[PDB]
C-alpha cells in the first residue's frame, strides 16, 4: 500500500525521542485481552475488553476464511455502534487498511472512496437507506469489481456481520501491517472536487492517541460519551474511543449529540468526559435554560470542543452553566492537534485553541508568498511533526500544491500565535465551508450544481449563522426559474450527505468570473 | 445627401394634415428680414432680424465665392455666440448641411463627425484649445481631405470668419436644399462606440420648431435666455432659439447656466423664459437660499426643465421659491419631444414628463420581446411621427437594430403612461450615462479604456449623484493597480469632452456575467 514516507532522518529522530514505538494499533486492545471491565456501552449492550478482543478475532478469522488478505483495503460504513470498534480492530489484526465512511455519507462519497482504494471488503448497515435493499449493492459491487466480500449489520441473510463476529476463531494469529506501513485511511475535510484520503501508519496514529491520553489524563476511570459520528478522528483518536480503550476506560455510544439523548446517558452511566462541536454546546446550554436539570451533568469533569472556533462568550458559559472544565481542540485529519491543557489559565482556555500536543510539532505562520511572519501576525498555518502526514493517497497533482519544498503542510487555515505560544484561529483560505464542525468542499458541490441543465454558473459560500457558525449558500446563474427545493431534490438524486445540501439557494442575474472574494463584497 | 425617407403613405398624410409645409428653415429668419426688432443679445452686442439675415447672406455669399456648393456638408463648432445663428442660417441659404459640434467636444468627436459627413467646410473658434494654434488644423485638414475652406472666429489672419460676415453680398440669392431633403445633422446621445448622426429634413425640423412655438405660446415678447450649449436641439428647436426667431422674440446668450451669470442677465434683459437641466435648477434654488435676491427673476414667466428626469421635490420648489410656471421637456435628438402644457394641473407638471407635441406622434410601451404592454405598465418607449427620423446617416448595421419592422424607433428609455395619457420616465435600457443631461455612450469610453496597456476589461456604469442625477464609474480589470488620475490623463490624451471622463475608477479582479451585468455593478 503506497504512501509518502517521512525522510529517514525524521523517522530516526521520532523513534529516538520515543514518539514512534513500533507497536501495531491492535496493542491498544490486546493489552486488555484478559480484562472483563466494560470497554463499550451501546444502549442495553455492554462489551468487556475480553469480548471486544474476542469479537475482533472472530471477525478477522471469518474474513480470512472468506479470502481477505494483508495489504488489501476495505470500505466500512458503520455509525455510532459497537460493531464500528470490533470491525476496526478485526481489519487491524488482518493488516487490511479501511476507510471509515460516516453513516451520513451517500452514493457520490462511497463511490469516490471505493474508486480510490479498490476495496476487497465492504461493510455497511441495512439500516442505511442505500443498503436496506440489494439494488444499490448490485450496482456498487458491479462498478467496484475489487470487492470480493460484503458483510452487513442488521441483515439475517448470507451476509450477516453478526454470524462472522459470533463464529469463534479456531486457531487465529494476527498479521497487522508493519508499524511503519499504512494502518488505515482518514478522510480530509476537503478543499477539492474529489475526496483526498490520508494514509495513517501505526507509529504515527498510535502516538497521536497515546499523547492525547497523557494530556487528557484518561485512565480506567474515563467514562467517555462518544455522541458525534464515531468514525471521525476527533471522536476516534483525540483522544477519542481508541484513547479510552488504551486507558482501559468505558466508551458510551449515542446516535447523536442531542440533549434529549445525551443528558439521560450522562447521568445513567456517570459520564465524566465527552466531545462536542460548538452548536451542540449551544443547544445543551439552551436545554438547561429551557429547564433541564443541571444535576444530570454532575459527573461531567471535562467537555472537549473542536471542529470549529468556540466563541469566548460560549466558552465562558461552560464552567458557569454546566460546571466542568473546557478543553478547546483545534485538530485536523491530516495530523496536527492543538489542545488547551487541564492546568491552563481560564484566559487561555476561553480565548485560544491551545498549542500542539507534541514538542516536535513544528508550526509557523506564512504570508501570501511563503515567508515566516513574526509572532502575533495573522497568516497561513504551516506544520509538520511525528503524527502529521507527508502526502494524500495517490494524489501527486494535489500533493505538489499541499506541501512546501521542506515537507511542511499548509492547513489552509489563517492563525496568529500569542507571545505565550498559543494558537488562535482567525480565518480560512481553503475553499471549505465549516457547517457546525462538518466540512464541505465547495468545489465538490459546485461541480454537482453545474451538472443541472438549468445551471450555467455556481458559487457555494459560507454565511454567518448564530447556531451553526456557518450555513451554506448556493449562488446560481440559471437559464430558467429554479427554486431551492429543485436544487435540493437534484443534489439528493446525485447522492450526497444531508449536511452538504445548500441551506440557502439564490438565483442571481450574474456572478463575477467564480471570483468568490468579489462575491463576498 | 442620402437619408432614410418616410414611406410615401406617411409623407402624404403628414402633408395632408399641415405638419409638412414644404418650406425651407431659412423662412424662420427671412420672414423678419425687414424687422429692426432685436433677435439676438450677446454681451454688449444686439443684432436685429434685418442684421442677422444680412449677416447670414454675407457669409453665404463669401462661402459661395470660396467654392462651397449646395448638397455639400460642413463641420461647425461655435459655442453660445451670435455667429452660431448667422452660420446656421448662411449654410441653410446655401443648401450646405452642417453638424453643430458643442464647444466641449475635442479631437475624437470632431474626427468622428468629419469621418462620417466628409465636410467641404470647417468653422471653429481660436478660443477653443484645439484651434488657438495651427498644429491640429494641419493634421485635421490632412486626415479629412474633403475640407477645402476653414473659417475661424477670433482669428485676424486669412481665415477670419468676421471678414466673411462683414463683406456685403452684392446680388445673393438663396439655394436651400429641397424641403423634403436633409437640412442638417443632429447628434444622438449615443448608445454605441462611434457617434450616430440624425438627418433632419426642413419639413420635419420646421414642424418640430413651429409646433413647439404653439405649445409654449412664444411671441415677439418672448425674451429667451439660451444658457445651455446653444447648438443642442433642446436649446435650438424645443422651441429654443429657432422658435424664438420664428415668433420674432429675442434670444439672450449666456456662456453657461451659472446663477452668477444668468441672474444678472434675466433682470437686465427682463428674460421671461429659459431652459435648464435639473442640476442647474438645484444650483439656482441654492443660490437664492445663499442670499441672491428673488426679485432678479421676477420677469421669468416659464422655466423649461429636461434632458434628465426632474424629481417631484425639485419641481414643486420652482413655483414656490422662483415664482414662474414649470415645463417638463422629455425630448430626444432622434425627434419625439414630450411637453407638459402651460394649462396642465400642478399634478401633471410636477410628477410627469407630459405627452407628445404631435397628435400623430405614435407612442406605445413594449415588453422585452416587442409586444404592447397595457396602460400603466413599465416598458420600452416605441415611437414614430412627422418629426421623428427613420434612420441614422450611413448606418445600415445599427439602423437594422434601432427600428422594428413597421419603422417604430426604440428610444432605449423605460416609461409608463397615466390613464390621462401622460409619460413618466422610469429607467433606461440603452448603454448610456445621463450625467446632468449630458449623454455618454458607455461603449465609446470602454473602447478608449481598453486601448490602455494596463486595461484588459472595462465597464462604464452610472452611479446615483444628488446634484447631477448620475456620475460615471469605470470598472476596470487591470494588469496592475491604476489610479483614477492615470485613467483621466490617458482619456484626455485620446481627446474627449471633460464630461466624458469617469468621475470614479474601480480596479477589480473580475466582472459579473449573465454579458456584463451593469445593473449588478450599479448596486456595487
Ligand atoms: C480527525 C482528526 C483528528 O482530530 C481532530 C480533533 C478536533 C477536530 C478535528 C477536525 O476538525 N478535523 S477536520 O479534518 O474535520 O478539519 C480540520 C479543520 O477543522 C477546523 N478546526 C478544527 N478545530 C477547530 C477549532 N477548534 N477552531 C477553529 N477551527 C477548527 C480547521 O479548519 C481545521 O483545518 C480533528
Ligand atoms: C435634440 C432635440 C430636441 O429636443 C430635446 C428636448 C429636451 C431634451 C432633449 C434631449 O435630452 N435630447 S438627447 O438626444 O440629448 O437625449 C435624449 C435622452 O435624454 C433623456 N431625457 C430627456 N429629457 C428627459 C426628461 N425630461 N426626463 C427624463 N429623461 C429625459 C432620455 O433618455 C432621452 O432619450 C432633446
CB A92 within 8 Å of CB A236: no
How far is the C-alpha of A253 from the C-alpha of A225, rounded, in Å? 6
* CB-neighbour burial class of residue B395 (10 A; exposed 0-12, middle 13-18, buried 19+): middle
How far is the C-alpha of B266 from the C-alpha of A77, rounded, in Å? 89
Helix (H) or strand (E) segment spanning residue B318? none
* Chain A residue whose CA is closest to B515: A510
Closest CA to A194 of A76, A114, A121, A136: A114
The answer to whether the Cα torsion of A409, A414, A416, A422 is positive or negative is: negative
- Rounded alpha-carbon distances, angstroms, from residue B239 to A325, B52, B206, B469: 85, 19, 10, 24
The answer to whether the Cα torsion of B28, B29, B33, B37 is positive or negative is: positive
Per the listing, cell 486507558 goes with: A247
Closest CA to B382 of B396, B400, B399, B362: B362
Question: Residues B212, B218, B220, CA angle at the centre, nearest 5°?
Answer: 140
How far is the C-alpha of B78 from the C-alpha of B85, rounded, in Å? 9
Closest CA to B238 of B141, B145, B167, B306: B306
Task: Enumerate the β-bridge partners of residue A124.
Answer: A152
| DSSP-derived secondary structure letter, A320 | I
Nearest CB to B510; choose among A477, A509, A512 = A512
The answer to whether the Cα torsion of A215, A217, A218, A223 is positive or negative is: negative
How far is the C-alpha of B157 from the C-alpha of A366, rounded, in Å? 72
* Chain B residue whose CA is closest to A456: B514
Alpha-carbon torsion, ordered B102, B108, B111, B112, to 10 deg:
-80
Instruction: Give Cβ neighbours of residue B197 (< 8 Å, ≥ 6 apart).
Output: B99, B113, B116, B117, B185, B186, B187, B188, B392, B393
How far is the C-alpha of B137 from the C-alpha of B118, rounded, in Å? 15
How far is the C-alpha of A443 from the C-alpha of A500, rounded, in Å? 12
How far is the C-alpha of A18 from the C-alpha of B204, rounded, in Å? 99
Structure determination technique employed: X-ray
Output Rg (C-alpha) for chain A, integer angstroms: 23
How far is the C-alpha of B306 from the C-alpha of B233, rounded, in Å? 12
- b vs e for A461-473, b when ≥16 Cβ sit within 10 Å of the residue's Cβ? bbeeeeebbbbbb
Packing angle of the helix pair A202-216, A240-247 (nearest 10 deg): 70
- Rounded alpha-carbon distances, angstroms, from residue A95 to A74, A98, A160: 11, 10, 22
How far is the C-alpha of B45 from the C-alpha of B22, rounded, in Å? 34
Closest CA to A38 of A230, A200, A256, A223: A223
In ligand 1, which atom is closest to the CA atom of A333? Answer: 1
CB B226 within 8 Å of CB B262: no
> Taking the CB of residue A367, how many other CB atoms lie within 10 A of it?
12
Task: Enumerate the β-bridge partners of residue B459.
Answer: B475
CA of B172 to the centre of ligand 1 (A): 96
φ, ψ for residue B63 (rounded to 5)?
A: -65, -40
Q: How many residues can be counted in chain B?
A: 524
Give first-to-last CA distance, chain A, whole Å: 46
Closest CA to B266 of B296, B307, B235, B306: B296
Grid cell in block for residue B310: 426632474
Grid cell in block for residue A138: 448490485
For ligand 2, say whether the CB of B431 is within 6 Å of any of its atoms. no
CA of B337 to the centre of ligand 2 (A): 8
SS3 state of residue A106: coil
For ligand 2, say whether the CB of B332 is within 6 Å of any of its atoms. yes
Q: Cα A352 to chain center, whole Å?
A: 22
Closest CA to B450 of B386, B397, B516: B516
Closest CA to A334 of A275, A280, A413: A413
How far is the C-alpha of A149 from the C-alpha of A63, rounded, in Å? 8
Per the listing, cell 442531542 goes with: A258
Q: Which ligand is nearest to the CA of B100?
A: 2
Question: Residues B233, B236, B237, CA angle at the centre, nearest 5°?
Answer: 80
Edge to edge, the sheet with strand B273-276 lists B45-48, B38-42, B250-253, B223-226, B273-276, B302-306, B325-331, B337-339, B355-356
* Chain B residue whose CA is closest to A511: B512
φ, ψ for residue A167 (rounded to 5)?
A: -85, 110
Q: Helix H segments across A37-144?
A: 49-65, 82-94, 107-117, 135-143
- Name all domains of chain B by residue range, CATH numbers in brackets: 1-430 (3.40.50.12780), 431-523 (no CATH)
CB B379 within 8 Å of CB B365: yes
CB B488 within 8 Å of CB B502: yes
DSSP string, B401-446: HHB-TT-PEEEEEEEEE-TTS-EEEEEE-SSEEEETTEEEEHHHHH
- Rounded alpha-carbon distances, angstroms, from residue B120 to B89, B151, B394: 17, 11, 18
Grid cell in block for residue B474: 469605470
Instruction: Give Cβ neighbours of residue B245 (< 8 Å, ≥ 6 apart).
Output: B28, B29, B32, B39, B49, B52, B85, B251
Chain breaks of chain B after residues with C–N above 2.5 Å: 514
CB B506 within 8 Å of CB B475: yes
Closest CA to B503 of B436, B403, B451, B415: B436
Which of A:438-457 have CB within 8 Å of B?
A: 457
SS3 state of residue A513: coil
Q: Are strands A325-331 and A337-339 parallel, antiparallel or unpaired?
A: antiparallel
How far is the C-alpha of B417 from the C-alpha of B394, rounded, in Å? 34
Edge to edge, the sheet with strand A97-100 lists A149-153, A121-125, A73-76, A97-100, A182-187, A197-201
Resolution to 1 decimal place, in Å: 2.7
φ, ψ for residue A440 (rounded to 5)?
A: -125, 115
CB B306 within 8 Å of CB B336: no
SS3 state of residue B302: strand
- Chain B contacts of A455, Cβ < 8 Å? none
How far is the C-alpha of B60 from the C-alpha of B169, rounded, in Å? 8
DSSP string, B467-513: TTEEEEEEEEEESS---HHHHHHHHHHH---GGGS-SEEEEES--EE
Task: Enumerate the β-bridge partners of residue A304.
Answer: A275, A327
How far is the C-alpha of B236 from the C-alpha of B243, rounded, in Å? 8
Instruction: Give Cβ neighbours of residue B505 (< 8 Å, ≥ 6 apart).
Output: B473, B474, B476, B482, B483, B484, B487, B488
Closest CA to B428 of B389, B439, A480: B439
SS3 state of residue B234: helix
User: How many CA atoms are closer than 13 Å to the CA of B362, on its beta-carbon side?
Assistant: 14
How far is the C-alpha of B37 from the C-alpha of B55, rounded, in Å? 15
User: Ramachandran region of residue A220, left (φ > 0), alpha (ψ -120 to 50) or beta?
Assistant: alpha
DSSP string, A454-507: TEEEEEEEEEEETTTEEEEEEEEEESS---HHHHHHHHHHH---GGGS-SEEEE
Q: Do A512 and B514 touch (CB under 8 A)?
A: no
Question: Residues B358, B362, B363, CA angle at the centre, nearest 5°?
Answer: 110
- Rounded alpha-carbon distances, angstroms, from residue B394 to B122, B197, B203: 21, 9, 21
The answer to whether the Cα torsion of A429, A430, A432, A434 is positive or negative is: negative
Q: Which ligand is nearest to the CA of A410?
A: 1
How near does any CA of chain A get to the CA of B472, in Å? 21
CB B425 within 8 Å of CB B413: yes
Q: According to the 3-state scheme, what is the secondary structure of A266-287? A: HHHHCCCEEEECHHHHHHHHHH
Grid cell in block for residue A272: 465524566
How far is the C-alpha of A356 from the C-alpha of A363, rounded, in Å? 8
The answer to whether the Cα torsion of B81, B85, B86, B92 is positive or negative is: positive
CB B373 within 8 Å of CB B365: yes
Grid cell in block for residue B156: 485676424
- Rounded alpha-carbon distances, angstroms, from residue B290 to B283, B284, B285, B286, B287: 10, 10, 9, 6, 5
Q: According to the 3-state scheme, what is the secondary structure of B112-163? A: HHHHHHCCCEEEEECCCHHHCCCHHHHHHHHHCCCCCEEEEECCCCCCEHHH
| DSSP-derived secondary structure letter, A138 | H
* Chain B residue whose CA is closest to A476: B514
- Chain A contacts of B511, Cβ < 8 Å? 512-513
Grid cell in block for residue B64: 459661395
Q: Cα A157 to chain center, whole Å?
A: 31
Task: Enumerate the β-bridge partners of residue B76.
Answer: B100, B123
Which residue of A509, A514, A517, A521 is the best one to mutate when testing the B interface, meaning the one whose CB has the most B CBs within 10 A?
A: A509
Q: Do A515 and B520 touch (CB under 8 A)?
A: no
SS3 state of residue A129: coil
| DSSP-derived secondary structure letter, B227 | -
| DSSP-derived secondary structure letter, A403 | B
* CB-neighbour burial class of residue A298 (10 A; exposed 0-12, middle 13-18, buried 19+): middle
For ligand 1, say whether the CB of A411 is within 6 Å of any of its atoms. yes
- Rounded alpha-carbon distances, angstroms, from residue B6 to A66, B20, B190, B456: 92, 12, 23, 43
Residue nearest to atom 15 of ligand 2 (CA): B189
Grid cell in block for residue A373: 511572519
Grid cell in block for residue B77: 463648432
Grid cell in block for residue B178: 429641397
Helix (H) or strand (E) segment spanning residue B181? none
- Provide the greatest CA pair distance for chain A: 69
How far is the C-alpha of A300 from the C-alpha of A272, rounded, in Å? 4
CB B448 within 8 Å of CB B483: no
Amino acid at each position: 500500500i503506497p504512501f509518502t514516507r517521512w525522510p529517514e532522518e525524521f523517522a530516526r529522530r521520532y523513534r529516538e525521542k520515543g514518539y514512534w514505538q513500533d507497536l501495531p494499533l491492535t496493542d491498544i486492545l490486546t493489552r486488555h485481552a484478559a480484562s472483563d471491565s466494560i470497554a463499550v456501552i451501546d444502549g442495553e449492550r455492554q462489551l468487556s475488553y475480553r469480548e471486544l478482543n474476542q469479537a475482533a478475532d472472530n471477525l478477522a478469522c471469518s474474513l480470512r476464511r472468506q479470502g481477505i488478505k494483508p495489504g488489501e483495503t476495505a470500505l466500512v460504513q458503520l455509525g455510532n455502534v459497537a460493531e464500528l470498534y470490533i470491525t476496526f480492530f478485526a481489519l487491524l489484526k488482518l493488516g487490511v487498511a479501511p476507510v471509515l465512511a460516516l453513516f451520513s455519507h451517500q452514493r457520490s462519497e462511497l463511490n469516490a472512496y471505493a474508486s480510490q482504494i479498490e476495496p476487497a471488503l465492504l461493510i455497511a448497515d441495512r439500516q442505511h437507506a442505500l443498503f436496506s435493499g440489494d439494488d444499490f449493492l448490485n450496482t456498487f459491487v458491479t462498478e467496484h469489481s475489487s470487492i470480493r466480500v460484503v458483510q452487513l449489520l442488521n441483515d439475517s441473510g448470507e451476509h450477516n456481520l453478526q454470524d462472522a463476529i459470533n463464529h469463534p476463531a479456531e486457531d487465529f494469529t494476527a498479521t497487522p501491517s508493519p508499524a511503519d506501513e499504512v494502518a488505515y485511511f482518514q478522510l480530509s475535510g476537503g478543499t477539492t472536487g474529489t475526496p483526498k484520503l490520508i494514509p495513517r501508519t501505526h507509529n504515527d496514529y498510535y502516538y497521536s492517541v497515546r499523547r492525547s491520553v497523557e494530556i487528557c489524563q484518561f485512565t480506567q476511570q474515563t467514562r467517555y460519551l462518544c455522541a458525534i459520528p464515531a468514525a471521525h478522528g476527533y471522536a476516534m483518536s483525540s483522544p477519542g474511543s481508541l484513547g479510552v480503550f488504551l486507558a482501559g476506560g468505558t466508551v458510551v455510544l449515542a446516535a447523536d449529540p442531542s440533549a434529549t439523548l445525551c443528558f439521560p446517558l450522562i447521568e445513567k452511566h456517570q459520564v465524566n468526559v465527552t466531545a462536542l462541536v460548538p452548536p451542540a454546546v449551544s443547544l445543551w446550554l439552551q436545554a438547561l435554560i429551557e429547564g433541564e436539570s443541571r444535576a444530570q451533568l454532575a459527573s461531567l469533569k471535562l467537555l472537549q470542543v473542536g471542529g470549529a472556533r468556540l466563541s469566548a462568550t460560549l466558552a465562558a458559559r461552560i464552567p458557569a452553566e454546566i460546571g466542568c472544565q473546557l478543553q478547546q481542540v483545534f485538530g485536523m485529519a491530516e495530523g496536527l492537534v492543538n489542545y488547551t491543557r487541564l492546568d491552563d489559565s481560564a484566559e487561555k482556555i476561553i480565548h485560544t485553541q491551545g498549542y500542539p500536543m507534541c514538542p516536535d510539532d513544528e508550526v509557523w505562520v506564512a504570508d501570501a508568498e511563503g515567508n515566516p511572519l513574526p509572532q502575533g501576525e495573522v497568516g497561513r498555518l504551516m506544520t509538520r511533526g511525528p503524527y502529521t502526514f507527508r502526502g494524500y493517497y495517490k494524489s501527486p497533482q494535489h500533493n505538489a500544491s499541499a506541501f512546501d519544498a521542506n515537507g511542511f503542510y499548509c492547513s489552509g487555515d489563517l492563525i496568529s500565535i500569542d507571545p505565550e505560544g498559543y494558537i488562535t484561529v482567525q480565518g480560512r483560505e481553503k475553499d471549505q465551508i465549516n457547517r457546525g464542525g462538518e466540512k464541505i468542499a465547495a468545489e465538490e458541490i459546485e461541480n454537482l450544481l453545474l451538472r443541472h441543465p438549468a445551471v450555467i454558473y455556481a458559487a457555494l459560500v459560507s454565511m454567518e449563522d448564530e447556531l451553526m457558525g456557518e450555513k451554506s449558500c448556493a449562488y446560481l446563474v440559471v437559464k430558467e426559474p429554479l427554486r431551492a427545493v429543485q436544487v435540493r431534490r437534484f443534489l439528493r438524486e446525485q447522492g450526497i450527505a444531508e449536511f452538504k445540501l445548500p441551506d440557502r439557494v439564490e438565483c442571481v442575474d450574474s456572478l463575477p468570473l467564480v471570483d468568490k472574494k468579489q462575491l463576498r463584497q
